Structure formats: C-alpha cells, structure tokens
From a paper:
Alpacas possess three butyrophilin molecules: VpBTN3, VpBTN2 and VpBTN1. Among these, VpBTN3 accommodates pAgs and is required for γδ T cell activation.
Residue numbers in the entry:
A (entry chain A), B (entry chain B): 323 to 513
Write the structure that this text describes.
Amino acid sequence: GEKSQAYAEWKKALFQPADVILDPNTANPILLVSDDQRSLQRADERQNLPDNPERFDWHYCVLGCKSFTSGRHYWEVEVGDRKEWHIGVCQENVERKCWVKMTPENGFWTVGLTDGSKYRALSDPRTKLTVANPPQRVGVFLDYETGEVSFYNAMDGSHIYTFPHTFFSGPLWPVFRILTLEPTALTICPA
Amino acid sequence: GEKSQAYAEWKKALFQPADVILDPNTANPILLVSDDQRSLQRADERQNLPDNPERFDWHYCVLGCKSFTSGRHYWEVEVGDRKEWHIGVCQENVERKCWVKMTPENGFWTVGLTDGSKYRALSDPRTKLTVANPPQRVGVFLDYETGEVSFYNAMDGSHIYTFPHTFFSGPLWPVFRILTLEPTALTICPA
C-alpha cells in the first residue's frame, strides 16, 4: 500500500529504530513483564516485589531498559484489541512512589485508550482524539531536540496525535501503562 | 510562554520560512487579492477576468507565487474569526478548470473550517477534527522529501492535523480557498 510504504520510508529517512525491552525492576508490582521482556500483563492483585527506588508503586507503569538524551527514535507497540492501554515517554525524574497526574507538566507524554473506544492524549486537560480506524499497532516517535512526541497507526501510516513541542529535562524513557486485567497483552515490536 | 517558545525553536530548527504572496493570476474570479498580495477576500460575484490557463475557474482557490520541489518549508496564515477557510498545498498539475474533489488523490492537501465550528482535513473520506482551541493563526508545514503536510495552532503550538506521509509528484504550491462572504480576510504572515 502506498501509505504503508511512505510510512516505512519516513521512519527510515528520519528516526532510529529503538529496540525496546521492558525493565521488570521499574514495573508496578501488579504488572507482569514476560521473560523475553517484550510483553506486559496485569495480575489480579499486587505481587510481592522489592520496592527499589525505580519501581512505580502507584501508577501501573513500567519503563524501557534504555533512555534517550538526544536524537530521533521510534518504536512500535502491538496494542491489538486491548480495551485499555497508554504508551509514550517520561522523564527520568518523574515521581515513582507518590501519586502525580500523568501529564506533560509532571514529565509524562502518553496517549491511549479507555473502555474499548475512548482514545485520549494525556495532556492537561486530556485531549479527546477521534480515530477513524482503531489501531492494532502504534508507532511512538521521539525527537529529543525539538521536544516532539507523536503517535501513528503503524499499519496504515495514519497520524494519531502530536503533543505541543516542549523542552525535555533529562533522559526520556519509553513508558507503558495498563490498568485492566484482560486477555490481550501489550507487546513491543522488536527493531 | 514555553509552548510558543518551543514552537518557534522547532520551526526555526527544521523548516525554511516561506515568504508567501498570493498570485492574483491564479485566483478564481470570485476572489479578491489585496494590493500587497498577503490578504484574500471573496467578492459578491465573479469579476470579469481572463480565463488564462493558470486561473482556477471552478474551485474558489488561489496559489502562492513560488512552489516547492524539495525541502521543508512553513508559513503562517491569520484566519482570525473567519467562519470558513481551507489552506494547504496542491500539485502544479491539479485540475484548475473542471470540477474535481479537493483530495490528496487529486493533488490537494488542505484542512480548514466550515460554518464557524466544523474543522476538517480534506482527506477522502473527510476527517472530522476535534479542536479544543479554535486557531486564529495556522502554521502550514511541508516536508517534500518525507511527503509530510502538517498544520499547527501558530499561537499556542498545539497540533491540528498531519496527513498520512505520501509521495509527492512535481512542485507543490501554497493554496487558499474561501467559499463565503464575510468580514474577516485571510492574511498571510510575512516570513
């Protein structure tokens, strides 16, 4: 398809493919990280984990294993028919233990889905998205220098959302959040 | 402040600022192009102007005086409170005389406003946009090499719309369309 091909070529012209794996030491104790570190599920209740300082205690979040301090990066996430998910990037210095709202002001740039059909950007206030075809696979695109975080339907190349250009402070991490206990996992596409 | 600053730094970092002036020779006869070639209004009825080959005779369109065959470019348009307008880029080879639907397949990449409140991308089908803050000034962003046409609120840096990445055929011209008679002109911001 021409739109698929143009999407493939744009990613190659401009963005380094990140090979993102989930860091289980950061995962909220209700999350399960797969042994291959590409997939995420949710437990029925908090499991017994050591509360190391990096772990998200409150928000159902996990980070990637590598951060970005510069340049243009993308990765793709198989959200499949999940009813609920949010993905994007967050600053190294985000609050991990106490509650904070997951907003750019607090160092989170994420978009996703609630209740099967409600797409939102987690701006403050939240941005209601209108998405013609529900994505099965989402591309996350970072340009550190221009402060750009944008999201695409990775199967048809359609744009989902771009946050206002911002100024990042410190390293950015891929972040993933699931609130629900449902059959479809969240899975990272390898580079 | 930071949103405006980051928007300014991004467009300066990556996009060549276009100084766009309207070509009255291309303008549908119902259009009025200002003396300084920055502003566009509609007449009550078609003026008696020659149907030279470059003039749009069907769509209420006018082009800029320079095309893009390479590079990244931007320009901003003061739409103010005008209840109807569509802006973007089109191919040099668009149908100017006969009815065609303004779509990417027909060589037009445009977004805008109908009846005061209905924002759309003129994709096929049309994309209903949700815009929480109605723009007064719209930034038009072209990247020829990656087939990218995107639109921003130029006052607060908030994203409006990005077409799917495509493959461009030949030169791209700034294009402007107004259907209605109303008090507020469209005005191009100088570079």
